[PDB]
Amino acid sequence: TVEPNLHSLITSTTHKWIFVGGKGGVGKTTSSCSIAIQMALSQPNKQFLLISTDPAHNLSDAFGEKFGKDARKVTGMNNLSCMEIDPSAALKDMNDMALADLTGSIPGIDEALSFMEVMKHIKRQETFDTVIFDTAPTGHTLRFLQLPNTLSKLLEKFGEITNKLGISGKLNELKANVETIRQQFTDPDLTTFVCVCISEFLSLYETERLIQELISYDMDVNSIIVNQLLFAENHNCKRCQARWKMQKKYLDQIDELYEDFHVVKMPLCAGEIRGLNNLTKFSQFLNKEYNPITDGKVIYEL
Amino acid sequence: VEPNLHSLITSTTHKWIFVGGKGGVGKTTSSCSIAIQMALSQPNKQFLLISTDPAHNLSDAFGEKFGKDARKVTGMNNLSCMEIDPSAALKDMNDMADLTGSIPGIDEALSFMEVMKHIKRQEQGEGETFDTVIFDTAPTGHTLRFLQLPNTLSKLLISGKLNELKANVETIRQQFTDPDLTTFVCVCISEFLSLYETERLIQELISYDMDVNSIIVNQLLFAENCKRCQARWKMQKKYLDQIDELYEDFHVVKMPLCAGEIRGLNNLTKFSQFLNKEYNPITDGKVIYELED
Amino acid sequence: LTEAEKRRLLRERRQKKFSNGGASSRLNKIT
Amino acid sequence: LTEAEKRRLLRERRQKKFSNGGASSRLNKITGQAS
Ligand SMILES: Nc1ncnc2c1ncn2[C@@H]1O[C@H](COP(=O)(O)OP(=O)(O)O)[C@@H](O)[C@H]1O
Numbered sequence: 001t002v003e004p005n006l007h008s009l010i011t012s013t014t015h016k017w018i019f020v021g022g023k024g025g026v027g028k029t030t031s032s033c034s035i036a037i038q039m040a041l042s043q044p045n046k047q048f049l050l051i052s053t054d055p056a057h058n059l060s061d062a063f064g065e066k067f068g069k070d071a072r073k074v075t076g077m078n079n080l081s082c083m084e085i086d087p088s089a090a091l092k093d094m095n096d097m098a099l100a101d102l103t104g105s106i107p108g109i110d111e112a113l114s115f116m117e118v119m120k121h122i123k124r125q126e127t128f129d130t131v132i133f134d135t136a137p138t139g140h141t142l143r144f145l146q147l148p149n150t151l152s153k154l155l156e157k158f159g160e161i162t163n164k165l166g167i168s169g170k171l172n173e174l175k176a177n178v179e180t181i182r183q184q185f186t187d188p189d190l191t192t193f194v195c196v197c198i199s200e201f202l203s204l205y206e207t208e209r210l211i212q213e214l215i216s217y218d219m220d221v222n223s224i225i226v227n228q229l230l231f232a233e234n235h236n237c238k239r240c241q242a243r244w245k246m247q248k249k250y251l252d253q254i255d256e257l258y259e260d261f262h263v264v265k266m267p268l269c270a271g272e273i274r275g276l277n278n279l280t281k282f283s284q285f286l287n288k289e290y291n292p293i294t295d296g297k298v299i300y301e302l
Numbered sequence: 303v304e305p306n307l308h309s310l311i312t313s314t315t316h317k318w319i320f321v322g323g324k325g326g327v328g329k330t331t332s333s334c335s336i337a338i339q340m341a342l343s344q345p346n347k348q349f350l351l352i353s354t355d356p357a358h359n360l361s362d363a364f365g366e367k368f369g370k371d372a373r374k375v376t377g378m379n380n381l382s383c384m385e386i387d388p389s390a391a392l393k394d395m396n397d398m399a400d401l402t403g404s405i406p407g408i409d410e411a412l413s414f415m416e417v418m419k420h421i422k423r424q425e426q427g428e429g430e431t432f433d434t435v436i437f438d439t440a441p442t443g444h445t446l447r448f449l450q451l452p453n454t455l456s457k458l459l460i461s462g463k464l465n466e467l468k469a470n471v472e473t474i475r476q477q478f479t480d481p482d483l484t485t486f487v488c489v490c491i492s493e494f495l496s497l498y499e500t501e502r503l504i505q506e507l508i509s510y511d512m513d514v515n516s517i518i519v520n521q522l523l524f525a526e527n528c529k530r531c532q533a534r535w536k537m538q539k540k541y542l543d544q545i546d547e548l549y550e551d552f553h554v555v556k557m558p559l560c561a562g563e564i565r566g567l568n569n570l571t572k573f574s575q576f577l578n579k580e581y582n583p584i585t586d587g588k589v590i591y592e593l594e595d
Numbered sequence: 596l597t598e599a600e601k602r603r604l605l606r607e608r609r610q611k612k613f614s615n616g617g618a619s620s621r622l623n624k625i626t
Numbered sequence: 627l628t629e630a631e632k633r634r635l636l637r638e639r640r641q642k643k644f645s646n647g648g649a650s651s652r653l654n655k656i657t658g659q660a661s
Pocket residue numbers: 023024025026027028029030031058227228229266267268269270271272273274325493494495496
């Protein structure tokens with residue numbers, strides 16, 4: 001059967017691009033920090049970068065130290081770095097190196113700038129060995145992941161306007177770069193999308209639709225983290241027991257819907273999970289599955 | 303400052319009510335609840351709940367299917383919902399562009415067009431528009447881009463029909479910056495990530511001259527009246543003490559974590575009462591267990 | 596089953612579940 | 627103190643908290659007090 005953990009991914013020697021996504025507030029940032037820590041600890045000789053594409057960044061807030069537009073090592077890690085894409089700065093730099101304010105607040109500019117960052121890595125490919133993306137909630141991340149296509153068409157159309165309105169070299173460079181990205185993003189050994197959800201109707205239904213959308217783009221998804229589980233069958237109050245009954249109802253559907261996926265069940269801990277120490281502690285259960293009987297005390301150990 | 307939204311629920315001036323905050327805090331749940339309360343309180347008025355989250359949840363919340371064209375919520379006479387599918391909307395305009403249907407920002411562009419459409423219908427005395435629109439917004443970062451749009455666009459700006467858009471942008475900017483007409487209700491949970499994000503969000507909104515005077519603190523345990531719950535309440539209480547101080551000039555509406563998800567008109571209605579008359583853990587405790595299916 | 600065999604099998608099974616009208620069916624079973 | 631007067635007082639108070647370095651001060655209060 002399908003191991004209920006991310007060990008295969010954590011030990012992958014092929015993946016270059018790992019997206020962590022799903023509904024708002026389900027634990028994308030927490031999980032993406034966790035996966036990254038596990039990858040860096042499991043593969044000491046490789047360099048990892050965790051990039052936030054959520055315009056409302058939380059990497060700094062989760063680790064409790066200051067990251068920004070320039071990649072920077074996580075304090076206490078030899079081989080993990082974080083970057084929080086900064087649009088103001090990014091556009092300020094473009095303006096200097098060649099308005100930048102007014103386009104700096106245009107809806108879509110965040111996804112545009114995030115993708116541009118991907119393009120820079122590709123061009124240096126020809127660094128970090130693997131990039132993990134802590135993505136924006138579902139709706140806007142799908143727009144980002146549509147970019148390779150949206151973009152090749154826009155560039156084609158842009159070239160048509162130019163022919164009519166009397167440079168081809170740069171369009172081709174741009175198009176070639178987009179193509180490399182599309183090729184890599186649709187290669188199962190190079191990129192995967194790990195979904196995060198909670199065991200509730202709104203999250204489950206959104207996760208299924210997200211996954212269908214991803215598969216239709218030929219993006220790989222083989223892993224789902226189900227977060228914030230109560231495991232109240234393992235001194236639990238009336239509220240916890242009723243809520244766990246709900247969680248189990250959806251967990252049963254999840255087990256059937258995603259029987260072909262790694263389904264990784266993670267506990268709600270007795271506090272928020274912040275700082276390297278606590279994130280690492282939590283992260284162990286992505287590698288070796290949480291067992292409520294034996295590991296139960298860890299949720300109080302923050 | 304009363305710990306409820308009663309003043310907003312019974313307002314006779316508001317046309318635009320945004321509901322926003324960090325992901326998963328309860329924007330959709332709260333916006334439904336606020337909308338239900340207003341519709342129940344003002345039967346003579348028609349309310350539209352619109353989702354600007356591209357990953358729509360209004361249909362999932364109520365358990366019936368909505369779309370780009372307004373449809374009344376089953377069991378209400380004066381509450382409707384809207385969820386725009388950019389690909390459909392654009393196809394209808396084309397009939398009346400798949401490039402554009404998946405361009406990042408297209409969601410905020412169409413949400414904005416809908417607002418402009420409503421403004422125009424009203425200025426033109428069309429008999430069937432809504433009195434008040436409640437926005438169930440996307441999580442913080444993109445909702446700020448949306449709210450930045452009136453100004454960003456205002457700067458950016460056949461050419462006549464260009465300046466016709468100019469005048470509409472200005473009309474929206476005028477209304478969004480009028481505290482009688484427009485307000486933004488923050489939703490948060492009592493945890494550091496949400497707290498810090500909420501304060502930054504509010505500082506941005508105020509810099510836009512958008513009114514913010516109310517905050518919903520959701521998913522509260524109130525455990526002082528199970529070791530996990532006891533420890534998590536201690537955490538929530540620590541941030542709750544900060545919230546009380548920070549937002550002492552705001553309506554701070556404290557909502558309980560219920561013993562299940564809140565879906566369907568009946569359950570959302572039952573939750574919503576506590577936006578109008580503040581929840582009392584000792585008195586109303588039983589209610590968190592009264593959700594149906 | 597080898598490591599590589601199991602990987603290809605699951606890939607195919609995951610794919611098969613969304614093929615044809617699989618996706619639409621999955622949505623209905625959720626709703 | 628009528629509701630109109632109170633509404634106006636609260637509004638002035640809210641705005642003042644975000645004026646004159648009060649904004650950065652509020653942020654420091656949140657981060658400064660966090661673990
Ligand atoms: N399993 C968990 N147990 C306890 N707290 C959690 C867990 N997963 C996430 N959190 C907390 O819940 C909140 C939302 O998680 P977060 O990673 O910010 O979500 P997302 O990035 O998807 O918005 C944060 O306050 C985080 O500390």
